[PDB]
Write a protein that binds this ligand. Structure first.
Ligand SMILES: *[C@@H]1O[C@H](CO)[C@@H](O[C@@H]2O[C@H](CO)[C@@H](O[C@@H]3O[C@H](CO)[C@@H](O)[C@H](O)[C@@H]3O)[C@H](O)[C@H]2NC(C)=O)[C@H](O)[C@H]1NC(C)=O
Ligand SMILES: *[C@@H]1O[C@H](CO)[C@@H](O[C@@H]2O[C@H](CO)[C@@H](O[C@@H]3O[C@H](CO)[C@@H](O)[C@H](O)[C@@H]3O)[C@H](O)[C@H]2NC(C)=O)[C@H](O)[C@H]1NC(C)=O
Ligand SMILES: [Ca+2]
Ligand SMILES: [Ca+2]
Ligand SMILES: [Ca+2]
Ligand SMILES: [Ca+2]
Ligand SMILES: [Ca+2]
Ligand SMILES: [Ca+2]
Ligand SMILES: [Cl-]
Ligand SMILES: [Cl-]
Ligand code: NA
Ligand code: NA
Lengths: 213, 215
């Protein structure tokens, strides 16, 4: 008898993290000089993510992959003829997709009506579990209510999340209260073979203008 | 009132994964130009590895780190004067150590070979795997003891990088032995653990060969 020999691609597999569960991931393929029937297996602590068909070698995903929980891990693959089991190790390299969206931290301040233009009224933070460009956050005011008095222009958000006064206020001739709606969006990434900007759920900031006559 | 300002190093910390739990990790340091009293905090899904004292800023490790779970992560730090709270994101970069050792999936194996098996022919195969990656994750196999340790015994077998045990000699159920027990061991090529080059090894595993008389 000659030991079944694994092919030369069974040392590592690259699998993306968006891969659906029950998806055909790869095939355990080996060759025997004697043509004995071959039975395939996977073992060890991280073999829960996979599901080998013990006669064909079809492996399909049985647990989710996350780059933000296990970016790479090792598994024990096995080919066995009627006389010998050959066990060998495979490195699984998982690929990052933009799977996570900016999440806001805490939203109400109270600023004086005499505040100068450019003054920082408030600051917001939002974090994306993703790293690199798919983690980078862009801040947006989606609606100021009331819309009276160029409200759409009285406030500007920057990149730090500082909200800066782009205008003048008047407790008596504009409004005593603005509600700003804020979004957070990642600079972008790949999800499902397709460039995906993942955005957050609009949060609301309640500014109260203070009358100092 | 001017808002507290973090120092410019509070944007990221490089932490080794051998850092024991309850160890000073780093300090949250900020500066108020009004010199107000400062109260620090850590927030977010990944602040369970950390224990911040609110008034000092001392951060200690509350949960073990691992480069083989989470090699980099983010956490919300916070500084608050009596009047305003500043939150900011911090990036934790974890560094690999030789923390993991080669592990056999079974500690006891057992086989049967025929005395007429030619020299060079593969008897058995073993695998040991290190969760560690790189040179710290490379298993070197060794035969540490033959029992029966007769002269010939210590030269009749040889383990290879693949884990294949090969015949380096000839056998005899009658004129030699009808059993050889071999102690094996799997050692990594080496790496850094507690600021010292560490070679992490496995536990003695025993392969029981049985010779078959083919007269
Ligand atoms: C290493 O390479 C081997 C050999 O190329 C890969 O096995 C092959 O994988 C392909 C694609 O996954 C298989 O194709 C599929 O075949 C099924 C069955 O007929 C068919 O229904 C599908 O539509 C698809 O065509 C192919 O069967 C398989 N080749 C052999 C000889 O079995 C394997 O994916 C690679 N493994 C690793 C670890 O990267
Ligand atoms: C950012 O930089 C600051 C300032 O360089 C770092 O804070 C300082 O951290 C060191 C240790 O890294 C502290 O030293 C220790 O002091 C205590 C007594 O408080 C002593 O028991 C220890 O033996 C050690 O000497 C130091 O206190 C601290 N400095 C201040 C002004 O608090 C900080 O670690 C850095 N943060 C990051 C994210 O790297
Ligand atoms: Ca064969
Ligand atoms: Ca991701
Ligand atoms: Ca994202
Ligand atoms: Ca202050
Ligand atoms: Ca390690
Ligand atoms: Ca190791
Ligand atoms: Cl394993
Ligand atoms: Cl072991
Ligand atoms: Na994910
Ligand atoms: Na580790």
């Amino acid at each position: 008898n000659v030991a079944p020999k694994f092919l030369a691609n069974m040392t590592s597999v690259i699998l993306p993290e968006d891969l659906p569960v029950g998806a055909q991931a790869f095939w355990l393929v080996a060759e025997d000089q004697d043509n004995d029937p071959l039975t395939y297996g996977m073992s060890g602590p991280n073999a829960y993510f996979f599901a080998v068909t013990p006669k064909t070698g079809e492996v399909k995903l049985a647990s989710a992959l996350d780059y933000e929980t296990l970016y790479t891990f090792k598994v024990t693959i096995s080919v066995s003829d009627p006389y010998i089991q050959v066990q060998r190790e495979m490195l699984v390299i998982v690929e990052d997709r933009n799977d996570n969206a900016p999440v806001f931290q805490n939203f109400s301040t109270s600023i004086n009506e005499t505040l100068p233009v450019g003054s920082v009224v408030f600051s917001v933070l939002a974090v994306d579990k993703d790293m690199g460009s798919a983690g980078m956050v862009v801040y947006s005011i989606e609606k100021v209510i009331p819309s009276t008095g160029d409200s759409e222009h009285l406030f500007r958000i920057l990149a730090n999340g500082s909200i800066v006064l782009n205008g003048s206020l008047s407790y008596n001739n504009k409004s005593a209260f603005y509600q700003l709606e804020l979004k957070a969006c990642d600079l972008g990434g790949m999800y499902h073979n397709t460039f995906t900007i993942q955005c957050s759920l609009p949060v609301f900031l309640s500014i109260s203008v203070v009358d100092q006559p």
